[PDB]
Design a protein around this ligand. Structure first.
Ligand code: PRF
Ligand code: PRF
Ligand code: MG
Lengths: 259, 259
């Protein structure tokens, strides 16, 4: 099958935001950063081209794009001849923006642009090295009750232990998550227990990040908050949702060890 | 949801090797290097652990391991408590060795072992920048007929345009491939056309590398030859087959841009 934009499947963001009981105006801003590791098409003479794509979809877009549909759409490029890389980038912007309902940004980069680029970790302190027992992996937002009793602080925490189950497919999704806030100091055991409680929970990556943001806001009430997760790819695409009370986007899209 | 070695499914190497008209005495040595990006289990107190696994399966093993079955086997670790990282490595060596039919090597690495490690490209000259026209996409080993008529050389060539199809999932596989040899200098156009002709060919990653090796050996007759391909992951697992006249293992196992 060749180029087929009808393969793209929008999902309205409002569907799941409903269960978060979000007020008239969003309590966050941000974007979903996608990495497209398997971009490939043919040039006009039929010779294959390969590239990596970077896409930023605004959190305010009416729709997110369902990932399997995004994969199938990209595969439709594989046997299609295009006269230039410019055309490919242009079509991606057009088709993904039409699906999402808002202008998305797309970078199409040749593979040489990645030579010597680093694997990165996240900022601040890892909270994973704790001596606690966990036996109940059922989702429980109430694990955050009274979690922020401490002195007013600014800190950045991260964990590599985020896992949830894919809403449509049950297959596990693996991620790291970075939480930066200014407010009463958060209890790290409670936070890790809460994050681990996603382990047998069904939702999309974007929706998990919004749930973490909204739960921390309601239970811990920081003055400012950013939640950023980076998930490992499925079908050649990864999703990196960023949500913040005050920030727009992360500084870069550098990959982590499992990505 | 517990640890289950019965999920592993072997596939005999003999199926495709018989199709290549090879004897039990191989014309190559080497190994299949796998990267397990999503290795995760529970510690003795039920707290999730995450790691990256690096596995080497000897090319002399009776069997390769089917990738989906390998993924499902690894998933069975996700909700299983293990006493230590050493127990995990031991179980992996035991089960994977049993399935392959020969001792496999396993390294279980913490994610911090990858921090600030650079993405690499392949060695030598990239052959992809050619202004040629491709008229069909049918596999054709005869594209190598008379491809080695240059002076005696030792050189390393590579391409990022290797693609084949995975029949059992109906999904493309994407690879880069590095070819190092001592023999009559190879025609770059013939080599590139040959590799491009895999684009709609069904075979496993390991099998494609053996086909490339044996085709180059019979059509180009180098005195010595090494073929190393690095494929993008599927299901959290990537395969990197290495086959060589004289070398037992590749010089590195570092990830490339699309991996
Ligand atoms: N997690 C499973 C999943 C399936 N399709 C998806 N599409 C998007 N955008 N995000 C997701 O997390 C998923
Ligand atoms: N390429 C498709 C595929 C499916 N399962 C596989 N298992 C192995 N070991 N190699 C492969 O290439 C595949
Ligand atoms: Mg290293």
């Amino acid at each position: 099958n060749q180029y087929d934009p009808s393969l793209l499947q929008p999902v309205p963001r409002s569907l799941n935001r409903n269960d978060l009981h979000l007020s008239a105006t969003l309590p966050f801003q941000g974007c979903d950063i996608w990495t497209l590791y398997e971009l490939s098409w043919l040039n006009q003479k039929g010779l294959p081209q390969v590239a990596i794509g970077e896409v930023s979809i605004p959190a305010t877009s009416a729709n997110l794009i369902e990932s399997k549909s995004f994969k199938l759409y990209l595969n439709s490029y594989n046997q299609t001849r295009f006269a230039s890389w410019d055309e490919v980038q242009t079509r991606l912007v057009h088709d993904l923006s039409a699906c999402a309902g808002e202008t998305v940004t797309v970078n199409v980069k040749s593979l040489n642009e990645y030579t010597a680029e680093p694997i990165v970790t996240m900022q601040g302190e890892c909270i994973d090295d704790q001596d606690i027992e966990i036996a109940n992996y059922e989702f429980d937002d109430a694990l955050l009750q009274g979690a922020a009793q401490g002195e007013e602080v600014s800190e950045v925490l991260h964990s590599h232990l985020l896992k949830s189950n894919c809403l449509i497919t049950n297959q596990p999704d693996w991620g790291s998550v970075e939480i930066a806030y200014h407010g009463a100091k958060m209890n790290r055991e409670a936070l890790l227990r809460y994050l681990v409680s996603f382990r047998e929970h069904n939702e999309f990556a974007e929706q998990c990040v919004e749930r973490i943001f909204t739960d921390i806001m309601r239970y811990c009430q920081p003055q400012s908050l950013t939640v950023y997760a980076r998930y490992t790819r499925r079908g050649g695409l990864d999703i990196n949702p960023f949500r913040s009370s005050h920030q727009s986007a992360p500084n870069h899209n550098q990959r982590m060890a499992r990505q």
